């Protein structure tokens, strides 16, 4: 059960970025974002995930202010966590 502030499928930004809460049900292969092979990409290893926001598998994403994403999700803004 997703948190009350989870990013949802008719969120305009979620559509535009092709977010899914489950990276295995994402188009990460098609986008081929750089820095890791696409099958290795998910929110937990993304620069925009906020480790200090949320709880458990439901963490912040800088791009989705006021909400939570799933650590096992993905969107087309995926960028390697570099620091
Ligand atoms: S920007 Fe990164 S952390 Fe935020 S939803 Fe997309 S992949 Fe997940």
Curated annotation (Swiss-Prot):
* Binding-site list for [4Fe-4S] cluster: 43, 46, 61, 75
The free-text function statement in the UniProt record for this protein reads: Specific class of high-redox-potential 4Fe-4S ferredoxins. Functions in anaerobic electron transport in most purple and in some other photosynthetic bacteria and in at least one genus (Paracoccus) of halophilic, denitrifying bacteria.
Q: How does activity depend on temperature?
A: Thermostable.
Q: Which GO terms describe its biological process?
A: aerobic electron transport chain
Any GO MF annotation of the entry: 4 iron, 4 sulfur cluster binding
Q: Which InterPro entries does the UniProt entry name for this protein?
A: High_potential_FeS_prot, HIPIP_sf
| Quaternary structure, from the entry | Homodimer.
Q: Which PROSITE patterns match?
A: HIPIP
Q: Which UniProt keywords apply?
A: 4Fe-4S, Electron transport, Iron, Iron-sulfur, Metal-binding, Transport
The protein's name in its UniProt record: High-potential iron-sulfur protein
Indicate the family of this protein.
Answer: Belongs to the high-potential iron-sulfur protein (HiPIP) family.
